[PDB]
Write a protein that binds this ligand. Structure first.
Ligand code: NAI
Ligand code: NAI
Ligand code: NAI
Ligand code: NAI
Lengths: 401, 401, 401, 401
């Protein structure tokens, strides 16, 4: 309450956008009477999202998506601000859906949820809320995948706004954010030098490039592994070396998966890995780096550092795995940078305020964030940054037509 | 003939893809009987395109998009290889359309043309050819704009393939190509230092970024001007400074337009320009930098260097303009790098070989290059580069589904 | 003991050089009978230095240069390996010199000390040890400053080797090390975004450039402030913007002192600092950023984050200070990267083994590390990195002469 | 005269420093009566050096160090400004020393010469001038090598100032200058793509790093070959890959020597070079890349492009050599960038004005440029660039002491 108060005060002074949203809507309180339910990693940052939603006059009901990572002192700071928060260090799967169930026990008008776990529970086990439910906002990718399977099978009966697709998210979340946060998680938990070390990045998309770029930034010799030749050729042009994972693994000092795939490393590769090879996953679930395969194949297994688990193999070489193969920057770092998140939230807060406005006009279909929002957030960010860009004149506006 | 022969031998050893296309189709000669007509900047590189088309068994009939000489040693080298080439020797367009007319006087099956000047002449003044004409390939942007105005007004009656849109073009043409070639044109014609000088780049798209990137590569302090906030915000994130052209112009050492616009500089800005400011256009026509406005406003006007024209203004300050405000890397450099062009051509050679195959199956509509070609060219490039990437397995291919 | 054991096991697998020194001298035990005394920041890394010295057969007697930062569990792990370690969370100034006194109470042959606090205590209060004392190694800068004041006043009567000057230290310590460790300390303690933020670096020497470089690496727009025009001119050429601290301070998001000076910021500048400006010192003592001046001028003062202290000023703007103005990467991070340290140690280990060899041959004077050591460590590093460089042939060796 | 006039007008507007030296000494004409003799590559830039010296009131007597590169229209423009210039497309070795002889036939007070060819001719064949001769300025390296062999054998009897050693030259000449000018020479003469190509830089000193840096700048994957492990280790840390020339040569697209050595490539390596490998020398004489060895070993030899000579080897692979193995940016480019040269000149103009002042005070010894000049030029450059740096205060000036 007094610590979780500070963890939020710190975050608060660096969420420029949300503060702007909170002084251009705070008075008009457009979300009064309306109650927003949400399932999301609970910590200082996501909490400021809830707090500014509340500042807009909404009744926020949160669930601790992260049972393990629930920061007690923060959840308590939220309650003392009039925000229903159902979170427990449950650890047991059973208790999660139960909390999910309790937010629905509040029949919300709008829902900003995780992986569609909340909106899907409604459409298949609790239609009560399904009626009062006016709109849904989905940031994840798993979720959007799910809330689309519904739309295609006509089972979906509420408008959804996927904010995972907008050049502003891909830029700040996927590129700059996961880029900085991934390397920060890696060096705060290992204190290894990055300069003059071979870093292998598996996958060269938004995240791959970001991680790669930042790595080059730290002085690393970057090697990129790819499956899509078009990306592989771009990596070359970017001054990097491209090779098969089978061949790269033999020289890597760090290996980072950033592909939305599985088993990016085979028993083979892992056995080629040189001694002291640190592996991290900055992509999907915990399947990019074969954790199961490591566990079995391991002769020994031990905790070396707070977030580093080491595995000694038959070859006598021992490999380290950050955050147990889970999303390294989130489960070992601070997630994304405070302002990076500020923007990823600002987008969601507008996705909600959009659902509220063009409420009815919308039909039970999953919509991609409206391009008008990106333009808005960008202008707001430039504005808080003290940057002013040129405005298109009529001679030109005409010319372009 | 003996010089133009070498200018082609040089290019020839660095067109990896076209040589691959010429030894995997050279024997099978799939373009026999077929005659390809084309309007394109005539020089060593574009000539190797014609030569490899001919290697495939085609009768190539070329027109000199660009005003050449009667004995231009390259044109003569092509003739001595059995390639009808109608080169223009004037500035006035009277003679240009005339040559355009003579390629049609050969009634071609396929056409790789410039700005649609060739395919549009057919549909509106020469329907004879319009029947034998089986397909058209359009690389430009003005052209595709034009050959679309037709399709929309149903006046188009032949399938068209726009190769201007494919991530491979945007990458190699727009980014790395114009990026390198633009700075090369600028420093071979001025020999000024780039390090520690303020470079202003107007526009931050594919070309903007590339030029920007490369400039930073040369040591310049880059300033970006933009109209689209989403791009402007990305420029900040990339470590650059963003300001209005009005404000940047006061400190620029070089100014480079890369926006598809006009009058990126007003009389105002030009008079703010410091003395010795070199301006170049790497974008559209010769209207990005107001050449007309410079000519009028100028107190003096003189040729300083082979491609630099200087204008002394009322303020006593004199500004320089590269390539008369025209596309600087093309009219002052060598166009794009040899292999950059090799790829931009390889794409077109396949666009033609596609029109030939899926010939009839296609209906008088403008099609975007088939994604299967990009994938192919990339694989071919990686292969000549000696790079091998990972192949997707079944566990994963299944997983992704 | 079981935690401090791991904190050392971790470090141990990433100290390539020291392990090499520990298997090319481990058997020969050249430091038997000899006891090494040392005053140094006590933690996992410096401990492995002591451990490998002991592996060489020396009796190591350590003092906790850092009273406050003494990691009990690590000190205890050292003791359980036969290493006298006098460290206490003393906090009281009095107890520091007392432990310094107890290592002398062991009359050492060689001394690797901190700021000359140990060798100066001998020459001015305890000449007993001054006789058995055979050699001294000085890594600091303050120390070497001091142990030179002695040599010049003939008060010094023992050979000293200053390892602070060698291109290998300046490279790994001053450049890459402090460069990475500084940004790591700053982002693990604030989780702020670095991309698209103005970073101001005061001073452009080894450390300035490194910090600058890395900052650029993270996406920041870098501004450099300098007093030596030669450096300032180099910063421009490197693509950065240079201005007076008075002017830069008005736009900085981070300010980092890296000059070996004091009051790099005046009451003035601090009052120009924008709200939320984070300040960090990566240079000398805690005087670069005027901490005293902040404390007085402050209307409020509060702890915001574990290593961030915030000061609200009369202007209502509040500024933050990392690690209380002390060396930010050391007192808020992990000091330098593990391998960076491995090399900074390897150099000292040889400085000792040099004092042992060319023991007598040397006269009571302060010597700069012998260039022969740099060459050795570099070759050892290249070797552990798996890098092989060309060997000069006779045609060339002769040619160069 | 009217062309050579413009080639000089162009250069003139981008020699900020020399213009400043020409309006802070132009009135005072401190070099009246005094005649300056000099042997230097004659072209627009070096000519502006002569012209500003003349502006200071000196009688300039120039020789065309470059017999082949003498730009007639420029030499004639100098004469029409009252400057004795002995230059001829001699081509014949005999005629060079003859012109050298004619500048001495003018008995100069000061000499800015090339490789000591002028000052050494005096001390060994023409002592007449040796008496009136008051001072000598040496910029080269060969020269300084020579004029030192004299000093050591007491044969030297006139004060010499070596401007080749000053951090300002190493910076602008060796680093940024040769760095930009080298890549410009290479891409204006080949138009090959640099991005995504392997660039091998032999030698990692001031020149090596610059070339390397810039190459990375253009998107190349850089490979560095070195003999000094300290540099090799720095290259790794800089994000590059280091290997033996024998191994790098097999994958290079460009090879650039920047070591002050010979036969950086053996018959062996040359035969490993892949087809189309372009080689350039940016270092010493024409012996870094074994031109003689190429000539012999070659099965064919032909001119491919104005500055590219190609050699087809027994293995059927043909390699290209820029500028015949000579300093590539000078003999194939424009030498260094205009302002880079402006600074390298400004330094020499002060070295002369220093010889004039502290004329007698100096004894027949070779002196390294006085650090007071570096400081001066840097301040002058910062000033023309519109940059203002902080001034050290008393609290600090005292502190530092
Ligand atoms: N760390 C974080 O906080 C964040 C993580 N992500 C995750 O990062 C992953 C990738 O993000 P994006 O780059 O935007 O996806 P993307 O589609 O833009 O890039 C994916 C690339 O991975 C490559 N790839 C697939 N399998 C591979 C394999 N076995 N080896 C090497 N390369 C392979 C593909 O060819 C593709 O180009 C996603 O799973 C996403 O959920 C997304 C946002 C933030
Ligand atoms: N030099 C060459 O060889 C090549 C030239 N181009 C030309 O470059 C131009 C742009 O190409 P791209 O960048 O890839 O398209 P793009 O759409 O990605 O770049 C356009 C950018 O310019 C900005 N912009 C428009 N007007 C502006 C103004 N008045 N001031 C500042 N910014 C402005 C837009 O907001 C946008 O971000 C086109 O005209 C194209 O034809 C394209 C390929 C190669
Ligand atoms: N944080 C760490 O772990 C490390 C810290 N250091 C410390 O960093 C400091 C600098 O190290 P170096 O850069 O190698 O010395 P340096 O001499 O190479 O750099 C110092 C620079 O500060 C500039 N400077 C002085 N006063 C200034 C002012 N008022 N404003 C702006 N610039 C100013 C000087 O012109 C000089 O170039 C030293 O005090 C050193 O002990 C050194 C190594 C590691
Ligand atoms: N192109 C131009 O206009 C200019 C050329 N130079 C020339 O560049 C050359 C080097 O300049 P710096 O870098 O300042 O000298 P440097 O000493 O700073 O760097 C030269 C490096 O070459 C390396 N080296 C020597 N032999 C080698 C071999 N066989 N293989 C691989 N590496 C080897 C050495 O370890 C040395 O560090 C000199 O000969 C100089 O005259 C200098 C300035 C301008």
């Amino acid at each position: 309450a007094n610590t979780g108060e500070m963890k939020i005060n710190w975050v608060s002074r660096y969420m420029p956008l949300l503060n702007k949203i909170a002084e251009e809507y705070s008075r008009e309180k457009p979300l009064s009477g309306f109650t927003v339910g949400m399932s999301i990693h609970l910590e200082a940052k996501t909490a400021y999202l809830a707090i500014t939603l509340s500042k807009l006059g909404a009744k926020v009901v949160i669930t601790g998506s992260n049972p393990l990572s629930t920061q007690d002192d923060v959840a308590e700071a939220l309650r003392s601000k009039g925000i229903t928060v159902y979170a427990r260090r449950t650890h047991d799967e059973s208790i999660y859906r139960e909390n999910l169930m309790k937010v629905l026990d509040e029949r919300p008008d709008f829902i900003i949820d995780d992986g569609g776990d909340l909106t899907v529970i409604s459409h298949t086990e609790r239609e009560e809320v399904l009626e009062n439910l006016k709109g849904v906002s989905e940031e994840t990718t798993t979720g959007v995948r799910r809330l689309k399977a519904l739309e295609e099978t006509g089972k979906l009966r509420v408008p959804v706004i996927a904010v995972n697709d907008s050049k502003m998210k891909y830029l700040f979340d996927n590129r700059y954010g996961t880029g900085q946060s991934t390397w920060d998680a890696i060096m705060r938990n290992t204190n290894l030098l990055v300069a003059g070390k071979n870093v292998v990045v598996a996958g060269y998309g938004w995240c791959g490039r970001g991680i790669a770029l930042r790595a080059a930034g730290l002085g690393a010799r970057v090697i990129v592994t790819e499956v899509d030749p078009v990306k592989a050729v771009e990596a070359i042009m970017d001054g990097f070396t491209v090779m098969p994972m089978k061949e790269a693994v033999k020289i890597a000092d760090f290996v980072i998966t950033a592909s939305g795939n599985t088993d990016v490393l085979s028993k083979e590769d892992i056995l080629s890995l040189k001694d002291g090879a640190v592996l991290a996953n900055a992509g999907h679930f915990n399947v990019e780096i074969p954790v199961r395969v490591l566990e079995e194949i391991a002769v020994e297994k031990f905790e070396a550092r707070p977030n580093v688990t080491g595995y000694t193999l038959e070859n006598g070489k021992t490999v380290f795995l950050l955050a147990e193969g889970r999303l390294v920057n989130l489960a070992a770092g601070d997630g994304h940078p405070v302002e990076i998140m500020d923007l990823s939230f600002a987008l969601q807060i507008f996705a909600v305020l959009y659902l509220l406005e063009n409420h009815r006009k919308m039909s039970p279909k999953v919509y991609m964030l409206p391009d008008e929002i990106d333009e808005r957030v960008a202008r707001m960010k430039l504005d808080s940054l003290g940057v002013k860009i040129d405005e298109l004149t009529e001679k030109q506006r005409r010319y372009l037509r």
